Ligand binder design. Structure first.
Ligand SMILES: [Cl-]
Ligand SMILES: [Cl-]
Lengths: 126, 126, 126
């Protein structure tokens, strides 16, 4: 009463501003951390996708060859005894593309600097 | 002193409210972006999991068959010459289920609209 | 005018503080949710990586063996008729490590409790 109300409000503002700005920084860090983590997942997921496809590609080739050789062999035996397998090329791994979301997270982190609070200070309390 | 303290506090409130609301919108965007990115990762990861399992399934079948045919062949040769391989069915890819976390991110984004600040305006300064 | 300005400012502060604190809690929840989701993705992605590698390992072994057996067979036939395949060991799935980002998200969530606003109350309005 004696003259504190005006002073408590200002102190409250300084806290509000300090706590908010503190939180923003924490949030920016979390965003960058999420984008970084999302980016690593994308790399691994895609590299593993391409590994699986590269494999299917070779395997298909192998079974085509194996079935061919066994056929030749069986054939010979026939002649000798006379004288005397599913393809997997369709299996495909897809890749993910979240680069746009990753870039968006970094932009938002950078832009939160524009949402910080620059409290007008009252000398009479500073 | 002349009569500004009451006016600086209000201006500070308008900034606090404008900057916070601005940040909330930015954060909502980041959440939706994260959920969208998480959702795409889940789809690809699971589709690649199922591709790998579908493959193991066929491959096991193939090696069972190949070993069988080679055995028959070797057998014949025996008769002809007389007259004259690990299974992989156990390899399994697991799938992930983060749908609940994805839905939770979208709900939080929607609910932050309920955390916006509607500052009571003082006509004497408006 | 009669004496409300001082009272509207305080009411505005209570709202600012209530809405911010409410948002912080919402954000903490979103962070924990993101970390939990990121953690599940890491587990599945890595487990699927290791499954793919375990498979390549066995497959390479299988084709080495198959080519060997077919060679022996073809060889015999030669003798009998006389008397009468790419390796994939190089395909490798990589694993991801975002544990550090996951732990960082949880720390930030825990630390936001230190960014909450504890508004100094003015009895004259309470
Ligand atoms: Cl305020
Ligand atoms: Cl994967």
């Amino acid at each position: 009463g004696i003259g504190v109300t005006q002073n408590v409000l200002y102190e409250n503002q300084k806290q509000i501003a300090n706590q908010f700005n503190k939180a923003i920084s924490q949030i920016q860090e979390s965003l960058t951390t999420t984008s970084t983590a999302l980016g690593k997942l994308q790399d691994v997921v895609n590299q593993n996708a391409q590994a699986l496809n590269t494999l299917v590609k070779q395997l298909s080739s192998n079974f085509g060859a194996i079935s061919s050789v066994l056929n030749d062999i069986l054939s010979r035996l026939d002649k000798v005894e006379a004288e005397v397998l599913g393809d997997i090329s369709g299996i495909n791994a897809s890749v993910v593309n979240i680069q746009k979301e990753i870039d968006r997270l970094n932009e938002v982190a950078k832009n939160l600097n524009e949402s910080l609070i620059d409290l007008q200070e009252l000398g009479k309390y500073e």
